[PDB]
Amino acid sequence: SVEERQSFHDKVNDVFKNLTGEAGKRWARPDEPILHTLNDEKEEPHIFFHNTNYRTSRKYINVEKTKILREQALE
Amino acid sequence: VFSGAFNTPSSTTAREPYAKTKSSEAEYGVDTPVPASALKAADKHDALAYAVANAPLIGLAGLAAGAQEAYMTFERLPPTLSRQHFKQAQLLLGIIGKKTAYATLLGAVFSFTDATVENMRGKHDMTSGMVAGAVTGFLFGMGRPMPQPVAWPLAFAGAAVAADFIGELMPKYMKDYRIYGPVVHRENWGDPVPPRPPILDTGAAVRPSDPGQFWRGY
Amino acid sequence: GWAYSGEWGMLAGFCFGTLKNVQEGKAWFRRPYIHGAGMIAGYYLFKAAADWEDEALKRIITRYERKGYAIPEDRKELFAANQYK
Amino acid sequence: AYILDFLSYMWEKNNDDSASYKEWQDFLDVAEKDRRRDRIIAWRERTMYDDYAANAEEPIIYKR
Amino acid sequence: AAAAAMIELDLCFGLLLLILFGLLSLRNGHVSLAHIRFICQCWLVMITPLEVQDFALCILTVVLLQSFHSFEALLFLLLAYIGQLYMMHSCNLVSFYVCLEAQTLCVVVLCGLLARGASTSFSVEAALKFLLLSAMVSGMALFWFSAMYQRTGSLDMVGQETFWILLVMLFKLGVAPMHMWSVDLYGSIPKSLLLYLSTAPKLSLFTFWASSWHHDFSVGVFILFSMFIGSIGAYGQPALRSLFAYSTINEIGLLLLAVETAGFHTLYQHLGIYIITQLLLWNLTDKRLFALCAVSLAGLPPFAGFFGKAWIFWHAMSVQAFSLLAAALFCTLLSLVYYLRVIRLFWTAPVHTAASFTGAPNQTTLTSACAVALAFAPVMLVKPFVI
Amino acid sequence: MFISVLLILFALCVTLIPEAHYHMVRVWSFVATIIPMWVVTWMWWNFDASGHGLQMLVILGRSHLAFGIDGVALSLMLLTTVLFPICMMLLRTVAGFMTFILLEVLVLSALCVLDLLGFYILFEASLILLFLLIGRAPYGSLEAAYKIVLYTMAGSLVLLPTLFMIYSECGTTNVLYMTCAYNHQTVLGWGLLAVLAVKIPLMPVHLWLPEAHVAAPTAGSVLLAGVLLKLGGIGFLRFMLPVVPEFCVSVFPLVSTLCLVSFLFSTLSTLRQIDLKKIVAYSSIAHMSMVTLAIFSQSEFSAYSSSFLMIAHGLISPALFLIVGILYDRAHTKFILYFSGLGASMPIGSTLFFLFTLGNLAFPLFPNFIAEVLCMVSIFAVHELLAYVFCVCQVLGAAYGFWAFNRVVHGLPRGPADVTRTEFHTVLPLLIGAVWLGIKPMA
Amino acid sequence: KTLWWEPYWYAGFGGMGVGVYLIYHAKPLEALDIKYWAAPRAAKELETEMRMLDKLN
Ligand SMILES: CCCCCCCCCCCCCCCCCC(=O)O[C@@H](COC(=O)CCCCCCCCCCCCCCC)COP(=O)(O)OCC[N+](C)(C)C
């Protein structure tokens, strides 16, 4: 319903407001994505930017995996 | 947000269609009624009655242009010609009547060709307007040197295409457009619900295409 | 209203004095008392405009709530505020 | 080559990742407040001032 | 009890004292009347109520009086201001008719009085044509008011007869195709009355429209006529007075687009920016600032004319008035060409500004330099300000 | 932000210097563009490449005008801050200095804005400056100035109601919330295509460029070619692709055929040109068509390759304009029939002309080679034939490039003497940038 | 005689060139390029994926 979507949006806004992280961790290189059952993840902007950062991380890691394996295969 | 690897909004889509957004506590439109002449003029099932309903308006444009040209010709008349009142009346009425009849002819040809192609193809789309424009512009462009028998069908077809895109297709595409209340398909963002659509005292050329766009009146 | 409206008004007064000199064929620094009076008037004019910003927001929220549009308390602070943004 | 190592240390000392996150959150909050205010304002009715039915709730005193 | 009407008694007493003071000053052979002008400005402030539009008109007329020098011209402008102020408070067609007719008579007499040199007969000719064209529009207003009064039995402004009253109002704004009286006036009448005619009556009539007018019709064909005719006419006319007359017709077409789609906030913002530009335009002595008027009347982005056009475009797109908006955008693209002609004429040219010899050295540099700071108003215009 | 206010106020103090101090006026206006180059280099130092996509954010309340840095904006800002002091070395009057200073303020603020209405306000506020720069009275052309201003105004006027349509639809023009709301993408997509297909020269709305880029002075040509065309590309990458992606998929056959015919027909037209500046001016249309198709492919690393081609073009084509400007300044013509044997009379200038000719034809050890290879990787991944069209037509670019070089450089030696120290140092930063970005661009 | 632009040209473009050199050669590697952030994280994932692929065979 609309009320449940609104309460979920309020919870997400409260969580991302009071968020912090230290000790060698970059925010916007998150360890895990945020799992959701939302129709169109862009309904919640904080979740959309978080999963965008996670997806960027995975694309660059897969490029690096390709380079390591190419060096091994050349050897 | 912005990376050189990809564009995340190009692959982040809804998996299901959405429900209709509630925009106000009252969901009935308020508007002034359309006159019956324009209601009858919209009907295309009788091609002849469509042309009869629409052509006098297009003849009004030729009447206005002919009255302009007739006054501008009358002002330049020397006194030896202007005092002959029967000859003056037949000259000026000839100019006005030729312009009015030519405009009415072009309008009737356009409306009849439009409704004929409409009824022949069994569906309403932009092809009937393009064909009617090509026919009317070829009627206007006949007998003239040659950029013109191609240029005038193109101009009348372009007028038909602009008419469809601006007056019909874009209002149909934006029927669910809301400027007030909750953002459509983003009701979780929490924008408040007003008791009614906004009351606007607009002119008769600006009327709500959907009952929820605004309430028109005073 | 806007926090930096008085400084904007002072820059407006300086440009006013410079233009009044340039129109009459004088160099930009001539008659600095004209610059000072222009700066004072620009400061108070743009502070009055910034006050009208808050006044207009207050009028909009008051009229909208009297008509029946109930605004939640998380959004009423966007309007009923002398915000010095 | 020690200058390069010390400049690397200077970069790491000056960068503050939590301050970057707070900058991002404040940007989003300011933009969201602007959007919310503008969306509420856009319920903008318009009739003449003498329309006593569209302006039935205003406290208006007339001298006539 | 008449205690609620002291401002009216004050108006009448002030006029009675001002005529006698002007008579006593002229019996001394005073060739200047700055004291009379200051008393006129004080009287203007003392009779104006505490509304935004009333004080906008009051401050505008106080600024305008610095370009007028004779006693009779000051009296005619005060009695035109009475009509301009009280038309904003008119709730009938009786007071509407009287205020409009007082304004027309004052304008006609001022056009006759202030002309000088070889342009005297041209100004008198254009004033006569304006009076004759105004008489028949006044007759149309009276005739259809009599029709409405007979049909309804009251003074309510409802029904089919309001269409002709609307046409009367469109005549008073110089809306094409009833525009040629203003085109005739721009070519001959001096610059101070042209400055007066482009600012104050438009404000007065649009405030009456905002305050007490409803009609069940449209003004869209007059929007199309005004925008296309004004743009093409200003593109085609080499005289600068005709250029500015046709560009004024284009601007009143944009203001009518703002009226037609409701949303009077964009109307008021664009009208205020236009009035400040007019105050700059007709008091220019340095011709380099003529280019600032050009870039701010073409709607170029950082200056205030862009903002005044762009809220009109925004509200038109909000209520989906697509065809009138497309015509407005085409005419905006056309208007840039002749505003660039203005910039070519007066910016890419050597600078010459003659000094004063008989005193009064460049006497309106204060107002023109103050109005050029419409490059600093855009910071306040972007906010929700005019609503 | 405080730094930007200080840089603007320092730059605007050129007007207050009395004109009789010539040396001071020259030094002040040159330093006023040197300082932003240092500041943008420092911004590159401050950037965290493993951090967020948007860094160094600032938003100015409820006035729109919000700013942020990503990679494309940062590379383009670095290129603009390189190009503006070279323009300062090619001007001689305070009017020119002030026009280019105002242009630098507007370009730098437009490159990193995050608001669509802010982008509209900041970009086409430069229109009247471009009109006065191109239609200057004794040696410009008013026809060219009218063409560029009217085409840009036409596109911007198509965009403006659609901008306001999405603003009424969601409540903001901020790109971070415009990308997360539901909007009518066909209308706004057509408005954005209308502006950015005029800014990038895409046929049929491309006829302003051959007139304007030739009628401009050498500094104006350097700015217009190297900078102002790329505002359409950054418009695509920053505003249109994130906010209307459904439109960006559905318009792909139309944008694709526009890019293909622009590339082919503009390359065919370049062969029949007889003016050296018109030869250099046409060649930019085909490169921008390759940029636009690589942006619209969205396939492998499309933003990266397209930005790299924008940088490679912005380095190579201003240098060709500089060499043509030297020839025009010291021979008073731009006509090919008046030039022959320039190798014997200007050996250094002809060597620079040959190197930048090879760079413009995307030969290796120039950044254009890497750029065109990666752009064709991005195009190939959608379909092989869309890459084949650009691959097989490489003889047509080399034909005009080598024909122009061989006609003006070899033969009977006639023409001006070799370059001065000042002309060599106008050319030199572009050459160093090309050698670096074509040999070791990344680490 | 030194031309008027020469000290300022050499200071500006030389300080840009030295600054670009120091960006490439003195920034931390993770701060210079994200491929240095992901190169060690890809290697451990590849270590725990090679033996998965060994067991699948
Ligand atoms: C879309 C990505 C941006 C790439 C654009 C192409 C740049 C052209 C040249 C390629 C150089 C590659 C440099 C790689 C290392 C430098 C730092 C870096 O990582 O790049 C920055 C930006 O790089 C730049 O700004 C490069 C500047 C290039 C401009 C050079 C031209 C100007 C010089 C002119 C000549 C000067 C000579 C003067 C000497 C006399 C960020 O890009 P990404 O790594 O994709 O960002 C990561 C994304 N995320 C945060 C979301 C995880």
Q: Cα(F180)–Cα(F242) distance, rounded to whole angstroms?
A: 9
Q: Cα(F277)–Cα(F213) distance, rounded to whole angstroms?
A: 8
Q: Cα(E116)–Cα(E123) distance, rounded to whole angstroms?
A: 9
For tokens 């709607």, what's the residue?
A: E299
Is F226 touching ligand 1 by the criterion CB < 6 Å? no
Q: Which helix (H) or strand (E) holds F8?
A: helix F2-11
Residue G50 CB-half CA count within 13 A:
9
Q: Cα(E125)–Cα(E111) distance, rounded to whole angstroms?
A: 10
Q: Is E286 on the interface with B (CB under 8 A)?
A: no
Q: Is B110 exposed, middle or buried (0-12, 13-18, 19+ CB in 10 A)?
A: buried
Q: Cα(B57)–Cα(B53) distance, rounded to whole angstroms?
A: 8
Task: Please count the residues of chain A.
Answer: 75
The distance of Cα B192 from the centroid of its chain, to the nearest Å, equals: 36
Among candidates F92, E217, E383, F45, which has minimal Cα distance to B218?
E217
**Residues in chain A within 8 Å Cβ distance of G45:** 61, 65
Cα(F70) to centroid(ligand 1), Å: 10
Question: Would the CB atoms of E220 and B203 count as touching at under 8 Å?
Answer: yes
Among candidates E122, B43, B210, E376, which has minimal Cα distance to C14?
E376
Q: Cα(E223)–Cα(B179) distance, rounded to whole angstroms?
A: 25
Smallest CA–CA separation between B36 and chain E, in Å? Answer: 16
Q: Cα(E88)–Cα(E77) distance, rounded to whole angstroms?
A: 17
Interface chains of chain A (3 or more CB pairs under 8 Å): B, D, F, G
Q: Cα(A47)–Cα(F423) distance, rounded to whole angstroms?
A: 54
Q: Cα(E245)–Cα(E241) distance, rounded to whole angstroms?
A: 6
Q: State the closest ligand 1 atom to the C-alpha of F82, by its place in the atom list counted from 1.
A: 34
Resolution for this model in angstroms, one decimal place?
2.8
In angstroms, the Cα distances linking E306 to B65, B169, D34, F102, F157 are 35, 30, 22, 19, 12
Q: State the closest ligand 1 atom to the C-alpha of A53, by its place in the atom list counted from 1.
A: 51
Q: What angle do CA G37, G39, G40 make, to 5 degrees?
A: 85
Among candidates F397, F406, F361, which has minimal Cα distance to F270?
F397
Cα dihedral B192, B193, B199, B205 in deg (nearest 10):
90
Q: Which helix (H) or strand (E) holds F120?
A: helix F116-123
Q: Cα(E66)–Cα(D11) distance, rounded to whole angstroms?
A: 64
Question: Would the CB atoms of C78 and D37 count as touching at under 8 Å?
Answer: yes
For tokens 């797109």, what's the residue?
A: E317
Q: Please tell me the experimental approach by which this structure was elucidated.
A: cryo-EM
Q: Is F158 on the interface with E (CB under 8 A)?
A: yes
For tokens 């659509």, what's the residue?
A: B197
Q: What angle do CA G1, G6, G11 make, to 5 degrees?
A: 140
Total Cβ atoms within 10 A of residue E118: 7
Question: Would the CB atoms of D42 and B199 count as touching at under 8 Å?
Answer: no
- SS3 of residue F48 by DSSP: coil
- SS3 of residue C3 by DSSP: coil
Is F442 touching ligand 1 by the criterion CB < 6 Å? yes
For tokens 């009937």, what's the residue?
A: B128
Residue E177: asked if its preceding bond is cis (omega within 30°), the reply is yes
Pairing of strands B199-200, B215-216: parallel
Among candidates D44, A52, C75, which has minimal Cα distance to B189?
C75
DSSP code at position F58: E
Q: Radius of gyration of chain F from Cα atoms?
A: 21
Q: Cα(C55)–Cα(A28) distance, rounded to whole angstroms?
A: 41
Which amino acid is residue G54, in one-letter code?
D
Is F429 touching ligand 1 by the criterion CB < 6 Å? yes
Q: Cα(B76)–Cα(B74) distance, rounded to whole angstroms?
A: 6
Q: Cα(F398)–Cα(F361) distance, rounded to whole angstroms?
A: 6
Q: Radius of gyration of chain E from Cα atoms?
A: 21
Interface chains of chain G (3 or more CB pairs under 8 Å): A, D, F
Total Cβ atoms within 10 A of residue E106: 22
Comparing CB atoms, the residue among C16, C24, C53 nearest residue E370 is: C16
Q: Cα(E37)–Cα(E70) distance, rounded to whole angstroms?
A: 9
Among candidates C49, C82, C59, which has minimal Cα distance to D44?
C59
Question: Would the CB atoms of D23 and F57 count as touching at under 8 Å?
Answer: yes
DSSP code at position F13: G
Q: Is B106 exposed, middle or buried (0-12, 13-18, 19+ CB in 10 A)?
A: buried
DSSP code at position C62: H
**Residues in chain E within 8 Å Cβ distance of F12:** none
Is F72 touching ligand 1 by the criterion CB < 6 Å? yes
Among candidates F228, F214, F219, which has minimal Cα distance to F141?
F214
SS3 content of chain F, % helix, strand, coil (to 5): 75, 5, 20
DSSP track, F367-397:
HHHHHHHHHHHHHHTT-HHHHHHHHHTHHHH
Residue C32: asked if its preceding bond is cis (omega within 30°), the reply is no
Cα(E85) to centroid(ligand 1), Å: 64
3-state secondary structure chain B: CCCCCCCHHHCCCCCCCCCCCCCCCCCCCCCCCCCHHHHHHCCCCCHHHHHHHHHHHHHHHHHHHHHHHHHHHHHCCCHHHHCCHHHHHHHHHHHHHHHHHHHHHHHHHHHHHHHHHHHHHCCCCCHHHHHHHHHHHHHHHCCCCCCHHHHHHHHHHHHHHHHHHHHHHHHHHCCCCCCCCCECCEHHHCCCCCCCCCEECCCCCCCCCCCCCCEECC
Among candidates C31, C1, C2, C5, which has minimal Cα distance to C16?
C31
Residues of B with CB under 8 A from a CB of E: 32, 166-167, 170-171, 174, 177, 179, 200-206, 209, 213-214, 218
Which amino acid is residue D22, in one-letter code?
K
Cβ(G33)–Cβ(F49) below 8 Å? yes
In angstroms, the Cα distances linking G55 to B158, E197, G48, G51 are 68, 92, 11, 6
Q: State the closest ligand 1 atom to the C-alpha of F428, by its place in the atom list counted from 1.
A: 40
Torsion angles phi and psi, residue F383, rounded to 5: -155, 150
- SS3 of residue F68 by DSSP: strand
- SS3 of residue F55 by DSSP: strand
Pairing of strands F55-59, F66-69: antiparallel
DSSP code at position E356: P
Residue F174 forms beta bridges with which residues?
F115
Cα(C58) to centroid(ligand 1), Å: 48
Chains E+G touching (3+ CB pairs under 8 Å): no
Comparing CB atoms, the residue among C2, C28, C85 nearest residue F16 is: C28
Q: Radius of gyration of chain D from Cα atoms?
A: 28
Cβ(G34)–Cβ(A60) below 8 Å? yes
Question: Would the CB atoms of F34 and G11 count as touching at under 8 Å?
Answer: yes
Total Cβ atoms within 10 A of residue B46: 12
Helix and strand totals (H; E) in chain D: 2, 0
Q: Which residue of F has its CA nearest to B5?
A: F301
Is F294 touching ligand 1 by the criterion CB < 6 Å? no
